[PDB]
Scaffold this active site. Structure first.
Site, mmCIF file in Angstrom:
data_model
loop_
_atom_site.group_PDB
_atom_site.id
_atom_site.type_symbol
_atom_site.label_atom_id
_atom_site.label_comp_id
_atom_site.label_asym_id
_atom_site.label_seq_id
_atom_site.Cartn_x
_atom_site.Cartn_y
_atom_site.Cartn_z
ATOM 1 N N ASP A 121 0.808 -1.193 0.000
ATOM 2 C CA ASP A 121 0.000 0.000 0.000
ATOM 3 C C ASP A 121 0.865 1.276 0.000
ATOM 4 O O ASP A 121 1.771 1.443 0.816
ATOM 5 C CB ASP A 121 -0.893 -0.008 1.220
ATOM 6 C CG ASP A 121 -2.032 0.938 1.073
ATOM 7 O OD1 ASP A 121 -1.916 1.949 0.381
ATOM 8 O OD2 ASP A 121 -3.081 0.646 1.566
ATOM 9 N N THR A 159 -7.026 3.033 -2.250
ATOM 10 C CA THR A 159 -6.660 1.641 -2.048
ATOM 11 C C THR A 159 -7.611 0.613 -2.637
ATOM 12 O O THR A 159 -7.206 -0.224 -3.443
ATOM 13 C CB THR A 159 -6.546 1.327 -0.555
ATOM 14 O OG1 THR A 159 -5.725 2.313 0.027
ATOM 15 C CG2 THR A 159 -5.957 -0.047 -0.315
ATOM 16 N N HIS A 309 -1.003 2.491 -5.325
ATOM 17 C CA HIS A 309 -0.858 3.916 -5.703
ATOM 18 C C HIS A 309 0.376 4.474 -4.980
ATOM 19 O O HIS A 309 0.921 3.796 -4.104
ATOM 20 C CB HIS A 309 -2.089 4.740 -5.306
ATOM 21 C CG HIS A 309 -2.461 4.548 -3.888
ATOM 22 N ND1 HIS A 309 -1.696 5.028 -2.842
ATOM 23 C CD2 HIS A 309 -3.449 3.818 -3.335
ATOM 24 C CE1 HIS A 309 -2.199 4.586 -1.705
ATOM 25 N NE2 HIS A 309 -3.270 3.865 -1.980
HETATM 26 N N1 LIG Z 1 -5.471 -8.568 -6.679
HETATM 27 C C1 LIG Z 1 -5.650 -8.260 -5.567
HETATM 28 C C2 LIG Z 1 -5.850 -7.903 -4.200
HETATM 29 C C3 LIG Z 1 -7.125 -7.667 -3.735
HETATM 30 C C4 LIG Z 1 -7.356 -7.333 -2.419
HETATM 31 C C5 LIG Z 1 -8.720 -7.199 -2.013
HETATM 32 C C6 LIG Z 1 -9.246 -7.960 -0.987
HETATM 33 C C7 LIG Z 1 -10.619 -7.850 -0.688
HETATM 34 O O1 LIG Z 1 -11.252 -8.600 0.313
HETATM 35 C C8 LIG Z 1 -12.648 -8.490 0.608
HETATM 36 C C9 LIG Z 1 -12.996 -8.791 2.069
HETATM 37 C C10 LIG Z 1 -12.996 -7.347 1.572
HETATM 38 C C11 LIG Z 1 -11.459 -6.962 -1.420
HETATM 39 C C12 LIG Z 1 -10.921 -6.212 -2.423
HETATM 40 C C13 LIG Z 1 -9.576 -6.307 -2.731
HETATM 41 F F1 LIG Z 1 -9.131 -5.522 -3.760
HETATM 42 C C14 LIG Z 1 -6.271 -7.225 -1.527
HETATM 43 O O2 LIG Z 1 -6.575 -6.878 -0.253
HETATM 44 C C15 LIG Z 1 -5.484 -6.809 0.681
HETATM 45 C C16 LIG Z 1 -5.997 -6.250 1.971
HETATM 46 N N2 LIG Z 1 -5.912 -6.996 3.081
HETATM 47 N N3 LIG Z 1 -6.294 -6.218 4.081
HETATM 48 C C17 LIG Z 1 -6.648 -4.979 3.696
HETATM 49 C C18 LIG Z 1 -7.096 -3.856 4.401
HETATM 50 N N4 LIG Z 1 -7.405 -2.723 3.765
HETATM 51 C C19 LIG Z 1 -7.255 -2.705 2.369
HETATM 52 C C20 LIG Z 1 -6.806 -3.793 1.618
HETATM 53 C C21 LIG Z 1 -6.482 -4.958 2.287
HETATM 54 C C22 LIG Z 1 -4.975 -7.497 -1.992
HETATM 55 C C23 LIG Z 1 -4.816 -7.823 -3.302
HETATM 56 CL CL1 LIG Z 1 -3.204 -8.138 -3.795
HETATM 57 CA CA LIG Z 2 -3.745 2.230 -0.447
HETATM 58 ZN ZN LIG Z 3 -3.453 5.850 2.130
#
Ligand SMILES: N#Cc1cc(-c2cc(OC3CC3)ccc2F)c(OCc2n[nH]c3cnccc23)cc1Cl
Ligand SMILES: [Ca+2]
Ligand SMILES: [Zn+2]
Ligand SMILES: *[C@@H]1O[C@H](CO)[C@@H](O[C@@H]2O[C@H](CO)[C@@H](O[C@@H]3O[C@H](CO[C@H]4O[C@H](CO)[C@@H](O)[C@H](O[C@H]5O[C@H](CO)[C@@H](O)[C@H](O)[C@@H]5O[C@H]5O[C@H](CO)[C@@H](O)[C@H](O)[C@@H]5O)[C@@H]4O)[C@@H](O)[C@H](O[C@H]4O[C@H](CO)[C@@H](O)[C@H](O)[C@@H]4O[C@H]4O[C@H](CO)[C@@H](O)[C@H](O)[C@@H]4O)[C@@H]3O)[C@H](O)[C@H]2NC(C)=O)[C@H](O)[C@H]1NC(C)=O
Ligand SMILES: [Ca+2]
Ligand code: NA
Ligand code: NA
Length: 805
Positions: A121, A159, A309
């Site tokens: 991130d 993000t 980003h």
């Molecule tokens: N290709 C791709 C990819 C997508 C995700 C992602 C996960 C998601 O999970 C569902 C339950 C909400 C949803 C959308 C996404 F884009 C991601 O998430 C990392 C993340 N873990 N913990 C955070 C805390 N805040 C923000 C992001 C994350 C990482 C990658 Cl490499």
């Molecule tokens: Ca971010």
């Molecule tokens: Zn930020």
């Protein structure tokens, strides 16, 4: 309700999700407040830390430890990542020379190289160079694998929009995650970073990689890590999953780091406090790679190191307040910060007017640091409009600034020194890509590309068929050693007609006039040949564009230009011409100022008429091939054909005339000739896609002449500029734009000045990819070159950004 008295015994970080009220041991349990009672004890062990030490080597297994240094740890898959280094005299992966991975070198029972996505991130692109002395593991990945100097995120540069774009290949407008905060008026529900509503599946459109994988029989690790699970544990969990038996082992994994974003907000992108977060991220990469090495997977796994980003310098004092512009400030809701989105505070207020809010926000202060737009007027490259969650009024905020409703919103919430979210062409928002592994190239640099392209490539890396997305599959083939996707050109749907001379002058009653009654066998055969296409090789350098939908159109040849003329829209779909370095600009002679000439190849019934423009007091006309660039006085008459005319607001004609009179010649001088393709675009429903006839909302008054929403040009030359555009042996160079066809120049605050002070700035803002134009026109360009199709696909995704280095 959760019956939390079940147990995570032998279930820690279980991949399949068990159903409430049965207690969860999978990753997301924390985020739903649903873990079993013993989840921390069993699954989040920390005892003795994350590293082996000499004294622990060959210890007796103690199941309380966070990781193991006992002789049985390898076969258990749960050694500390430095076990072999400390206890078996091995080297850290980072200290080994890099050696080309020509083929995957995988343990028996591995069906395909696994893929690990290592997402960071806030990892600004320039950190790769500026932080390289403190990131040795990342620098080895970068230098030994395949890397870009940067990767372009999507807008907004937040993000979840970007990580979900990475996962789906879709623009935010299509996937539905259009910011970190959102209101959906159909659901009447709000999405926030905080809290629980964001996990509801209705927010998330398209098909993310983990679903694409699962549907096609490929098992996936978690993509979401709860914030409280430390990075060392995320890595150990991935490594443990990789030790599973063949039928249970996932093929795709993701790691996520909250850093460097977290610190970047507090300290700015280059704050001295940023060195440590970068060291720590590098250490984590080191742990993964050592762990892979111990499992003999370091020359088997494909690793992607990718950011969502960048990060820019932003402080509280650089905040514009809507309370300094609007009187009605309490009648609006603003989504604030590095972008602005505005809607009515109450749908019951029928005295809310978007036109008056836009006008109160337009060019009101001399240094104003945001610009208001109705969303359909945003630069088409942003693809930020076709979603009910994107408010009609949008503010594009200058880099380094914020927008807020009122000052109290800033001090009742200076804390922060970094932020992101700005226009995705801004240098500070660019992020990183590195690919390392058997399927990626060795020591290879590739040009910058857009993160929308990666989904296809990740599907290629896993043997998956991608769901429909906004990537251009094949445009990133040059990243890969093998697993390329071999696309074919789309088939032409509509073949053109080639009309000859079929109409007498007197059959036309268009209300047009031209002083052209001025009369030779040498030059008579010569003009006949130009009308049959004898100069077409000069002006149509890459073949004619293919029309990919059903329609009726004519190819029209001329000395200086060729066009594909639509009988349905009564104007060209495209106009192609080549301007050499040597070409001369001339004026429109006095006697030809209002000249429009019937085209005896095209019926009256499929022609425009001058009377419509006379009667339409708002609408004037311009020409697609510019009369200024005629090769000769005699050839100039062709430029006044009614078949070369298009409807233009007088305000837009200032822009167009400067482009045609001054800029085309400048570019030919700078680029050693250029080929230009220009035309109209109709996107009245702002979906990024060509309108059908029945979607057109405006016509030249009292006629069937449809009014374009935009005008495009594609300007191509030789990448080796020592060769002229029309005799280029190698790769091409392109820049393009999609200019909004607006009845005012309100967008340009300095438009009262000479076009030389504002037009080019407008055109840079509306820079576009050839691909963007393809979507908007149903045309397929560059069909006849000497280049490989994958190279052409790359060219079609190029965006000329106009940022320095
Ligand atoms: N290709 C791709 C990819 C997508 C995700 C992602 C996960 C998601 O999970 C569902 C339950 C909400 C949803 C959308 C996404 F884009 C991601 O998430 C990392 C993340 N873990 N913990 C955070 C805390 N805040 C923000 C992001 C994350 C990482 C990658 Cl490499
Ligand atoms: Ca971010
Ligand atoms: Zn930020
Ligand atoms: C980028 O890539 C993407 C993906 O390729 C491109 O998006 C596609 O564009 C297509 C055309 O715009 C579109 O096709 C339509 O799909 C309708 C079925 O859609 C549902 O099912 C799909 C498949 O699983 C699903 O993906 C869709 O998901 C959307 O909606 C949910 C919310 O409800 C969200 O979770 C998700 O984010 C997504 O939202 C986005 O797309 C919709 C449009 O589908 C937008 O409204 C949103 O703003 C948002 O951007 C759907 O759940 C199908 O019903 C359509 O059929 C109509 O049109 C055909 C033309 O052939 C016509 O013949 C029919 O008559 C039919 O019309 C009838 O309905 C009309 C409207 O109600 C009505 O007026 C008529 O009178 C008729 O009754 C159509 O085929 C496809 O769904 C999307 N896919 C995605 C994922 O967005 C995108 O174009 C690319 N961008 C660029 C710039 O190139
Ligand atoms: Ca459209
Ligand atoms: Na007029
Ligand atoms: Na103006």
């Amino acid at each position: 309700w959760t019956a939390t008295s079940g147990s995570c015994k032998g279930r820690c970080f279980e991949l399949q999700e068990v159903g409430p009220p049965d207690c969860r041991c999978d990753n997301l349990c924390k985020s739903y407040s649903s873990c079993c009672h013993d989840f921390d004890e069993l699954c989040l062990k920390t005892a003795r830390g994350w590293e082996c030490t000499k004294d622990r080597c060959g210890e007796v297994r103690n199941e309380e430890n966070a990781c193991h240094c006992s002789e049985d740890c390898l076969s258990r898959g749960d050694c500390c990542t430095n076990y072999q280094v400390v206890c078996k005299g091995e080297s850290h992966w980072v200290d080994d020379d890099c050696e080309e991975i020509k083929v995957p070198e995988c343990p028996a029972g591995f069906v395909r190289p696994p893929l690990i996505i290592f997402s960071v991130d806030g990892f600004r692109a320039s950190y790769m160079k500026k932080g390289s002395k403190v990131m040795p593991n990342i620098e080895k990945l970068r230098s030994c694998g395949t890397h870009a100097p940067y990767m372009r995120p999507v807008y907004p540069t937040k993000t979840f929009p970007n990580l979900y774009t990475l996962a789906t290949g879709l623009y935010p407008e299509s996937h539905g995650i259009v910011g970190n905060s959102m209101y959906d008026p159909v659901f009447d529900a709000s999405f926030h970073l905080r809290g629980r509503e964001k996990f509801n599946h209705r927010w998330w459109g398209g098909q993310p990689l983990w679903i694409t994988a699962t549907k096609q029989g490929v098992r996936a690790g978690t993509f979401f890590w709860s914030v409280s699970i430390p990075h060392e544990r995320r890595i150990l969990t991935i490594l443990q999953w990789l030790s599973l038996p063949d039928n249970e082992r996932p093929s795709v994994y993701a790691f996520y780091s909250e850093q460097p974003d977290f610190s970047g907000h507090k300290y700015g992108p280059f704050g001295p406090e940023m060195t440590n977060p970068l060291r720590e991220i590098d250490k984590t990469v080191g742990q993964l790679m050592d762990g892979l090495k111990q499992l003999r997977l370091h020359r088997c796994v494909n690793v992607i190191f990718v950011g969502d980003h960048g990060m820019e310098d932003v402080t509280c004092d650089r905040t514009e307040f809507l309370s300094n512009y609007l009187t009605n400030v309490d009648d609006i809701t603003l989504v604030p910060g590095t972008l602005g989105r505005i809607r009515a505070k109450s749908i019951n207020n029928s005295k809310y007017d978007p036109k008056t809010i836009i006008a109160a926000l337009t060019c009101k202060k001399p240094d104003q640091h945001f610009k208001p737009y109705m969303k359909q007027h945003l630069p088409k490259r942003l693809h930020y409009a076709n979603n009910r969650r994107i408010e009609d009024i949008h503010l594009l905020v200058d880099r380094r600034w914020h927008v807020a409703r009122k000052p109290l919103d800033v001090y009742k919430k200076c804390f922060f020194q970094g932020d992101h979210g700005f226009d995705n062409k801004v240098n500070s928002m660019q992020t990183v890509f590195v690919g390392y592994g058997p399927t990626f190239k060795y020591r290879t640099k590739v040009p910058p590309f857009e993160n929308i392209e990666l989904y296809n490539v990740m599907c290629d890396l896993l043997g998956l068929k991608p769901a429909p997305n906004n990537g251009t599959h094949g445009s990133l083939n040059h990243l890969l050693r093998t697993n390329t996707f071999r696309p074919t050109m789309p088939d032409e749907v509509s073949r053109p007609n080639y009309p000859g001379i079929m109409y007498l002058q007197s059959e036309f009653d268009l209300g047009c006039t031209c002083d052209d009654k001025v009369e030779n066998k040498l030059e008579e055969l010569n003009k006949r040949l130009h009308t049959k296409g004898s100069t077409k090789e000069r002006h149509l350098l890459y073949g004619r564009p293919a029309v990919l939908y059903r329609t009726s159109y004519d190819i029209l040849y001329h000395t200086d230009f060729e066009s594909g003329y639509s009988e349905i829209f009564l104007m060209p779909l495209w106009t192609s011409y080549t301007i050499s370095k040597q070409a001369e600009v001339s004026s429109i002679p006095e006697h030809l100022t209002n000249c429009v000439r019937p085209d005896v190849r095209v019926s009256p019934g499929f022609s425009q008429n001058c009377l419509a423009y006379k009667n339409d007091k708002q609408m004037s006309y311009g020409f697609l091939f510019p009369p200024y660039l005629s090769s000769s006085p005699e050839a100039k008459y062709d430029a006044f054909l009614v078949t070369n005319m298009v409807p233009m607001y007088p305000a837009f004609k200032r822009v167009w005339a400067y482009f045609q009179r001054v800029l085309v010649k400048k570019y030919a001088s700078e680029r050693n000739g250029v080929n230009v393709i220009s035309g109209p675009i109709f996107d009245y429903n702002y979906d990024g896609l060509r309108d059908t006839e029945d979607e057109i909302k405006q016509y030249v008054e009292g006629s069937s002449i449809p009014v374009p929403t935009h005008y495009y040009s594609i300007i191509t030359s030789c990448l080796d500029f020592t060769q002229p555009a029309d005799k280029c042996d190698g790769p091409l160079s392109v820049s393009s734009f999609i200019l909004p066809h607006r009845p005012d120049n309100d967008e340009s605050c300095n438009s009262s000045e000479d076009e030389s002070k504002w037009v080019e700035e407008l055109m840079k803002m509306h820079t576009a990819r050839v691909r963007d134009i393809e979507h908007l026109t149903g045309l397929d360009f560059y069909r006849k070159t000497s280049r490989s199709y994958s190279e052409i696909l790359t060219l079609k995704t190029y965006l000329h950004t106009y940022e320095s280095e």
